[PDB]
Amino acid sequence: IVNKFVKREFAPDPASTLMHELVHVTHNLYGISNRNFYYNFDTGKIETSRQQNSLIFEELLTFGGIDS
Amino acid sequence: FYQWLRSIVKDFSDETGKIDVIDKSSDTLAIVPYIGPLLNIGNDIRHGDFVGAIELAGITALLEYVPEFTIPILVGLEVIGGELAREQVEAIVNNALDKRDQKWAEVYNITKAQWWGTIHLQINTRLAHTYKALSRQANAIKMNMEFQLANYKGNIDDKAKIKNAISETEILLNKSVEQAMKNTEKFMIKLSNSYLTKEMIPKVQDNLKNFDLETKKTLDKFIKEKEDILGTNLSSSLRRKVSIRLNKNIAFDINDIPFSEFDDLINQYKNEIEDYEVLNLGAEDGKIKDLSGTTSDINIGSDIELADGRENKAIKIKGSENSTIKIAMNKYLRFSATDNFSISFWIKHPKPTNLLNNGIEYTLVENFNQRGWKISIQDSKLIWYLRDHNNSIKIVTPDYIAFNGWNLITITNNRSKGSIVYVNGSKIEEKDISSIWNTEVDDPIIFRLKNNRDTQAFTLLDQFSIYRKELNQNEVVKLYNYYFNSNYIRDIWGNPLQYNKKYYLQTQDKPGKGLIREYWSSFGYDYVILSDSKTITFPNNIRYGALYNGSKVLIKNSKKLDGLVRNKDFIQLEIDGYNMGISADRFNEDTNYIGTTYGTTHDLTTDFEIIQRQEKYRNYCQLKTPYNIFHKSGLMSTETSKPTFHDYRDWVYSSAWYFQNYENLNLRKHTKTNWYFIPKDEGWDED
Amino acid sequence: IDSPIDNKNIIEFITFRTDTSGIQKKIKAYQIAKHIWVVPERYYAEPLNISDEYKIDGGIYNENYLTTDKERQEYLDAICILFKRINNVIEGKKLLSLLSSASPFPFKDDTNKYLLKEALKFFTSNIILFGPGTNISKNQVLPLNGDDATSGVGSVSEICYNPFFTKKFGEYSLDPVIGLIECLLKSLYNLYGIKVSDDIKIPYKLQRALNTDKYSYINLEEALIFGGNDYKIFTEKPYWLSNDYFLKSLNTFEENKAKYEKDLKNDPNLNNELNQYLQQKYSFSISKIWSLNLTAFADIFNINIPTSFLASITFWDRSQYYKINYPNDYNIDGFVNGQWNTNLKNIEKDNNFIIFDKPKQIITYINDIFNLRYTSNLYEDNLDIESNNYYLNFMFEYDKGNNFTINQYKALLDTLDNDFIDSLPPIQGMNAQNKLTSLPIISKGTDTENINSELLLPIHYLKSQTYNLDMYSSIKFTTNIYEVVSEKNSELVYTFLPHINEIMENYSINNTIKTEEEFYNWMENLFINYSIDILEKRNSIIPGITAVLPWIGKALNILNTNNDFEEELQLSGIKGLIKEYENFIIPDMIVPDIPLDNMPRTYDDIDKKLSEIYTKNKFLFLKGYYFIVQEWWTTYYIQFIELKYLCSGAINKQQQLLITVLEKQLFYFTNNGLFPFDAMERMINEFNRSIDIFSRISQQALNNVDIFINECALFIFNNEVYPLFLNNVENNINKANDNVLNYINKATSLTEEQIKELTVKYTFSSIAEVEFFNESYFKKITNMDIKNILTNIKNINNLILSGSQINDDITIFDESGNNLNIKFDPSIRIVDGHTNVAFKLDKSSQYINIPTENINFSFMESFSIDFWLKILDSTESTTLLNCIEDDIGWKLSIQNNNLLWEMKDNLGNNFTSLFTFNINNIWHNITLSIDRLTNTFNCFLDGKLINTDNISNIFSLETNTPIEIQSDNGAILLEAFSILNYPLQQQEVLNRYREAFSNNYTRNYYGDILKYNENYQLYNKTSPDKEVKKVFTNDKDYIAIEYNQNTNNPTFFSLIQKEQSKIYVEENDEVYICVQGDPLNYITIDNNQAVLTKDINLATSFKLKTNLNKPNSLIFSENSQALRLSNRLNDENYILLDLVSKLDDEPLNIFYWEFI
C-alpha cells in the first residue's frame, strides 16, 4: 500500500511459465488434447481485427482464471 | 504551485468520477458519460449524447460488431433396437433424458463460448482503449506540471519539494484514473452479461425445443413398443416422466459466468475497506495489540487496563498520566501532504460525575508537535483538529459523547476536497482541507488524557483503526454495519445483552419509569407496572430522566445458557425473583395484562421472545409475547389506565394489536413497544 | 336521533347572541359527550350568505345547505362517527375527558358559574359545536368573550365546523379528524384562558409573490397547534422567543391554582361539586397543553399530514373540495379504503356549492418579441402579511431562557385520570352568568392583483403540463414550451421527458396499436421509458450533495438554459435555485457587562459568578444560532419546500398525461369494436391495475427529489447563513473574552488562580467552543416533511409467513404487518430449521393456504419469492407452490430432484424453467425474483444468481385463487417463505442470505446446526465417498481415510467441550473431538499427527472457523495451523495439522470438514 509504485507492470515467474507447459505435457500424456475447439480470430468484415493466431480452447483451459 | 497542484488533483478526481445512474430495475447502469467524447462510440447513433445512446441500444452502440450467431441443426437423438430387458430399457429411457439435458447444457455452453469470443473480447479491448485515453490524459497533465516546474522563476534551489509534490500528484492522478476505469469496467461488464442472457439464449432455445420434441417423439415411440416388457405400471411411469421432462425449457446456469456481481460483492468489504487498514488497535486474548498486524512497536503504560466493551474487551485510559499508550510512527502511519486518510474508533465517554473539567479541553489521541492531527474531548463534545504550519481545521461533534454510549466516530480526510466527520455513520460536518499541506511529525501517536483536571476520569476505546483512503458515505455506513454483523441484542450503552445479568428495564416512551409489581388480592394477580418517575440533575444543571429506577429484571434462559442474547431467542424475564409472563386462561381477556409468578391463582406462559424488528444497531429491543391458545401473540407495551378503584397507573400488557400491524405503524407509535434494558454501568451514576 | 322529544341530552335553549334578523331564536342541541354539545344548524350569528366583496378565496357560501331533516341527521351521524374515532385512541379520549372538565373559573359573589345557555334552567357546556357559518370551508373557534379568554378565567367557545368536505394537497384526502381535533385544541386554549390575544405573532413564511419581500406572520396559537417541523425549531431546550405570554399565562395559572387550593377547595356550599372538575383542570399543567400539537395527533391516528408548513402548504393550489359520505366513506377506522384510495366525489355541482376562488397574484407571462401571453393563477394562504420587523429588532433575553416554557412531551396528554373524570357526574342546576362580549363578526379582505412577469415561472410550467379539454380528442406531447404557451393547438402539452416525447413523436391511435399483445407491450414500454427518464440521477462535485436530479430544471424553469442542469447548477451555484433575500438579519448578540457583587465567600465568589456568566453566554450564543435557524427556515427553506411541491405536481401532471393517453386507447377499442368482450375486460382491468404501478415509481422519483432538495437547503444554511453568524460570534466572544479579564483584575495578589484556572476554565478559547451545527439535525426536520404524496405503497414484504407452536397445536400467521388470513390444517408440524422455524409438509392433505387479496400479479407488477427448502426424504417428483386457477398462474415444484418453475398467463403464453442443480436433502435458500420492468426472471440459489432468464412474452397471470403450499408427494421442510413487493437484486439477495448465518452457528453437512455431544460421521469435503475412520491395526492409533475398504465399519465423531453446558456449537469456540467406542478416546496432536489418546486432560483444543463461501464445513484450527489430510502414502490419508494455506483469499478444500 505504501510502495509508491509508479506502474503496475509485473514480470512472470519462470516457475509458473514452465508449470503451464507441464499441464500441456500431462494432457498429451493422457490423450486429452483436441484442437477442434479453437477461436478463429480471422474476421474480414469488421476490417479492424487484432489479426491474431487461432487460440485453442485447450490453451485457455490450461492457463485458467477468468478466460477459462 | 501548491494551490494550482491541489486544484489539478481535485478537478481531475472529481471529473473522471462522473457517473450517470439510470434506474431501470435490475439493470441500474452507472454509465460514465465522458466516454462519449473520449471515445468516438455513440456519436453515430446519437451525436453528442452517450448515456442516451446506451438506452437506445445497450450493446449495438457500445460494440463495433454484432455477430448474429448460428448453431448446427441439432438432429434428434435415437436409441438402439434389440432383445432388451425391462430393467435395462428403463435405464435406456433415463439415459436418453439425461442425454437430452446434457445436450441442452452443451448448446448453452457453445453459445456462451461464442459470446465470450465475439462479445466479451470487444468489451476488453474497449476497456484497453479507455485505459489508453485516460493514461494519456494523465501524462499530458504531467507534461504540463513538469513544464511549470521547469519555469520556477519565483525562487531558486527550492524545486526539490515541488518535484516531490508533482510525483505525489502523479500518483493521485493514477489513482483517479484507476477508479474511473473501475467504474467503466463495472458498467460494461454488466452490459455484456445482459446481452448474453437476453439476446443470445432465446435464439438457441427454439432449435433446442425442436430437438427436444424430436427426442420426445422418438422416446414415446420407443415405449409403445417394448411396453409388454416394461409392464403397465412402469410404462405409465416412464411415459409420465418423458411427457413432463421433455416439454420444459432447461434453465441456463450462469453461476460460472466469467464476470459476475456475486464475485465482486462477496469480498466487497475486504477489497474496499479492510485492504487499506494500516492500524487497528484492539484487544485480543486479553492483550492490547494491532489487530491489523502492520506494526508491533506499540508500547502501553502501566496504568492502562482492559474493560468489558462493545464486542471484546475495550481499552480503558485511566487518565492518570501513566496510562499512556504510544505507537512509534512507521512508514504506514506517516501521512504526507497528498495522502488521504481516515480514522475510525469506538468511544465510551463516562458521564461527568463532578464539575471540575468544564471548559477545559483535554486531548484523547494526538499525533501533534505543534503540527499534525489531534482528537480531543471538550465538555461532551469531540474535537478533531488539523494544524499545518499556518492553517488549521477544528470540527466539533455536537453533544452526547459523554452520555456513556458506544459511539463510532469516523473522520475521513480527502486532502483535495475536505475533511468529514461522521458519528454513528451519520455525517456531522465537512470542512475545507485544501489549504492544509504538511501534518506529518515523527512523534509517536499518543493515546493519553493529558490536560485533564480530573485524575479519576477515564474513557473506553475500541478498535481504533486508521485507513489510507478517504471512505465516502457508502463505505462509512458499510463499516458501521460491519460492527453489527452478529444478531446480538444491545442494551442502552451498546454492549451485547447477557443471560445472567440483572438489568433495569424501561420503555422508550415514558422515560424515567422502571418496572415494579403490585399484587391484586381480589383478582389474585401480580401486575407489572411502570414505577414512579424520577429525574437526575447533571452538574451543568440540566435535568434528565433517571435510568436506575424501579426493580432489576434478570434475563434468563430455560437452561441457563449464560451466553449473549440474540435476535430471536426465547427468554424468561425474572423480576424480583418471580418470572414474568402472560395469563394462560380466559381470566384476563382485557388487553392481556402481564403478570408474574407471584400469586398461583392463574397459570402463566413465561416464555417471552426478544426481537429487534428495527435496525440491528438500536439500543432497544421489542419483547414479543408467546402465543397461547387464549391470547394472540403481541409486543410487550404499556397503557396508562385506572381499571378499577385502585389508583391511576401504567400497566404493562402484551398488545396483540401492535404485533399484527407493526410494519404499517409509523415510527412514532413504535416508541410504545421499545424497551431499553438499562445495565448498572460505571461511567453513568446517579448518587 | 334527529327527532327525540326532550330532556337529558336533548334540550332546547336560547342562543347566546342574536340572529341576523336582530333577535335571539330558540334552538335545540344534542349532548355528544360530557359538557360537549352539537347542533346541526348553520351558525345563527353569521349570515347564511354574504356579498361578493366579503367572500374569501376558497369558500362555498351556499345558503340552502343543512336546511332539512335528512341533512341535519347526516350531520349528527357524521359527528358520533368523528367523536367515536377520536375516542378510539387512548390519547383522543384523554383530550375529550380534559375538555369535559375544563370548565372556566366560576364568577365570584357566591361562586356563580361562567357563561352558559339559558333554558325556557342551565346546562353545562364547555363547547358548542355548530354547523358551518357563511363560509363552510372555514372551521373557526369563536370564543363568546375574547376579553376573558386571554386573562386566564376561560371561555366556553362556540365552534362552527363542517366535516363533509376536505381538501387533498396531493393524491390523498386529508383526514377530517385533523380539522376537528384542531378546533378542539383551539377551544381548549379558550377554556384554560390561554389565548395569544391576536397580537403575539411569529413569522411563518416568506410571502409567495413577485414584488413582495415581506413575511406572512402566523398567530402564535396557530403555530403551537399546527406543530409539524416548524414548531420543533423554536421549541428546543434553550428558549429564545419565549416572551411575556409563556410567563404571563404560567404565572396567572399559578395563583389561579393557588386561589382554588385555598378558597374553593374548602368546599363552599355554592360550588355544587365543581371541586373535582377544578381539581383535575388545575392538576393538569399548561406546559402539557402547549405540547399538544396537530401533527402528534395525526401520528396517533396514523394519518399522513404535511408536517412542513401545516398552516399554509394546503393552500398552494386551486381549492378543490371532496364530499365525504360518512356512513360509507368514513368509519371508526378512518377512510374505509385507506387515505389514498378514497375515491371521493368532487363537491362541484351546478345548483349549490359555488367555490368562489380569487387567486392571489394572477401572474401572466409576457414576451416582448412574440405575441405570447400566458396567464397563470397563484394561490396563497390567508395569513396576514407583515414586514421584516420581527427579525430586525428581536432582543434576546440574557436571564430568561432554559426555564421550561415549551417542552415537547413525547407522551402527549398522559398525566390525568381518564375513568375518574368520566365517572364524575355532570353539572346540573346552579345558575350561570352571561356577559356576551361581541366577537369579531365583520371582516373584509384584499382582492386579487394582476402583476406581469418577464420569465416563465414554475406555476406557468405546471399549467402547461395539464390537459385542458375533453376525452375525444388527440394528445400531442412536445418539449418546446414556447409551442404550448402560445395556445395555437389547444391540445399540445409540454413534457420534460425526452424518452416519453420520442415515444409519442411517432404514435397514432389508429394504427400504432392493433392487438392485445401490442397494447400490453406498449403499456410496458411507456412504464420503462417513464421509469428511466424520471429516476435518472447523476453525482455532482458540489460538496454536501450526493446526487443531482437533472429533470428539475426542465420542470420548474429553474436554471433552465441551453447548458445542462448539472452544468448550470455548477456555475450558477445552489443560490440560483433561490430568490436571494437581500435583507437577511444576522443577530448582533451584545453581551452584558459583569456587576460588582460582593460576598466574602471564598474570594468574592468569582468562580460561581463567572460560571453562571459563562453558561449564560454559551446559552445566549445558542439562542442566536436558534434565532438564525428559524430565520433560515422561514426565508430560505420555504423556497425549497415550495420547489418540492412544484416538483410533486409536475411528476403528477406527467403521470396523468400517460394515463390520459392510455385511457384514450381504451376508447378506440370500445367505440370502434376492435376487441371481443372477454379480451376487452382484460385491458380495462389491466389499465386500472397499472395506475398503482405508475404511482409507485412517481413516488420513488419524488423521494429522490426530497433528498436532493434537503441537501440544497442545508447547503444554503452551510455557507450563506451560518458563516455570517460565526463572524458575529467572533467579535462578540472577544468582547466577553475581554470583559472577563477586565473584571478578574482585583490587585488582590492571587496570581496562581487567575492565570491557571479562572482565565481558561470560564473563557471562550475560540469559535470551536460554540458552533452548534450538525447536519444530523437539519436532516431530521427536513426529512419526509411532505411524504407519500402519490401513494403509501413501497418496497415492502407483503408476506413473511412465520409460525409458532404451543403444546401440540401450531399457528401460522403473516408477520409482515399485512395481517393476512393464512389458512392451514392443524396437522402440520413445526420443527427447528435454518436459524428459524420450518413447517413440515409431510402428507399430501397437509396444506398452507395464503390469500392473495392484496398481492397483485399484473404484467406491470414485479415480485419475488424467498424461502428455505429441504427435502426430508428422497422424493423424485413433488409440488411446492401452486397459484394457478383454471390453468392460469404460476407454480413451483420438484421434478426428478430438479426445480421446476413453470408459469403461464391468461393469453396462453407458457414460460418454464427447469433448474438442474439436483436438490439433495440440503437446506437451500431458493429466492427467485420476477422483475417485470426489464422482463427478467432471476433465480438466486444460496445468494448466487443462476438463471436471469427473460420473461418478456408472458403477460398478466392474475388469479383469484389463493396460494396453496402442499408437497403432494413427500416430506419437505419449508421455512421463511416470504413474498415481496419488489424484485430482489444480487446485492440485496446476498445481504439477506448472509443474515441467515448471523447467529454464527456451525452447521453440519445437511445444513442443520451442529450440536455438542451428538455423534456424526466425518468427511474431508474432498473425498465424501470415504469416511474418516479410526485406525487400530497399529499400536499408534490414529484417524485416517482408508482406501482398501475391504471391511466397512463407520466411526462417529462428536464435538465435546469440558463444560457440559452449551448445547449449540457457535463459531470460534474451543472444542474437543470425541470418538465413539468402548474406550471412548479423544483426539490429541503428537508430532502434528492426529492420534487417538484416551483421558480428557491430554486432548487438544480446536477453534472452529467457518467460511461463508462453504457454509456446511468446519475448520479445526489450532493457533495458525488447521487440520489437514496428508498425501496418500499406504492407501491411508492420515490427518495431520498443517499451516493454513489460502487459495483465492480462502483456504484449500482439504482444511474443511463436514459432519453427517
Please write out the topology.
This is part of a larger assembly, with two copies of chain A and one copy of chain C (1156 residues).
Chain A: H1 14-29, E1 38-39, E2 55-56, H2 57-63
Antiparallel strand pairs in A: 1-2
Chain C: E1 10-14, E2 26-33, E3 36-38, H1 69-88, H2 90-100, E4 117-118, E5 122-123, E6 127-130, E7 140-142, E8 158-160, E9 165-166, H3 176-192, E10 201-206, E11 215-219, H4 220-225, H5 244-264, H6 275-283, H7 286-289, H8 294-300, E12 322-323, H9 326-329, E13 330-331, E14 334-335, E15 345-346, E16 362-367, E17 372-376, E18 385-386, H10 389-392, H11 418-423, E19 450-453, H12 458-465, E20 476-478, H13 482-485, E21 492-494, H14 498-505, H15 516-535, E22 537-538, H16 553-556, H17 565-572, H18 606-662, H19 665-672, H20 677-744, H21 751-761, H22 775-782, E23 797-799, E24 802-806, E25 809-813, E26 823-824, E27 829-832, E28 837-841, E29 848-850, E30 863-871, E31 877-884, E32 889-895, E33 898-904, E34 910-914, E35 924-931, E36 936-941, E37 944-945, E38 949-950, E39 963-965, E40 972-980, H23 986-995, E41 1018-1019, E42 1029-1031, E43 1038-1042, E44 1053-1056, E45 1070-1075, E46 1082-1083, E47 1092-1093, E48 1102-1107, E49 1110-1118, E50 1121-1125, E51 1132-1139, E52 1142-1143, E53 1146-1147, E54 1154-1155
Parallel strand pairs in C: 3-6, 6-8, 16-19, 20-21
Antiparallel strand pairs in C: 1-2, 2-3, 4-5, 7-8, 9-12, 10-11, 11-18, 12-15, 13-14, 16-17, 23-40, 24-25, 26-29, 27-28, 28-40, 29-39, 30-35, 30-40, 31-32, 31-39, 32-33, 33-34, 35-36, 36-37, 36-38, 41-54, 42-43, 43-51, 44-45, 45-48, 46-47, 48-49, 49-50, 50-51, 52-53
Helix pairs in contact in C: 1-2, 5-6, 12-18, 14-15, 15-20, 18-20
PDB class: toxin
Keywords: Botulinum neurotoxin, botulism, toxin
Entry title: Botulinum neurotoxin serotype X in complex with NTNH/X
